Ligand binder design. Structure first.
Ligand code: CL
Ligand code: CL
Ligand code: CL
Length: 58
């Protein structure tokens, strides 16, 4: 499974969003062919979707 580092924090205020802080390493559960889409991941015991541009694939 791909991992990615958060370049910026995401508050993830909407239901289904995955919040994270800058520097967190997110486990990617689903990605698309664009890093401008919302991808699916998990970190900190939460699961959800987030803007893929906020992360850098390891
Ligand atoms: Cl935000
Ligand atoms: Cl892209
Ligand atoms: Cl969750």
């Amino acid at each position: 499974s791909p991992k990615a580092v958060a370049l910026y924090s995401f508050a993830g205020e909407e239901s289904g969003d995955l919040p994270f802080r800058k520097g967190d390493v997110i486990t990617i559960l689903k990605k698309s062919d664009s890093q401008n889409d919302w991808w699916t991941g998990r970190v900190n015991g939460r699961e959800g979707i987030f803007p893929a541009n906020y992360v850098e694939l390891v």
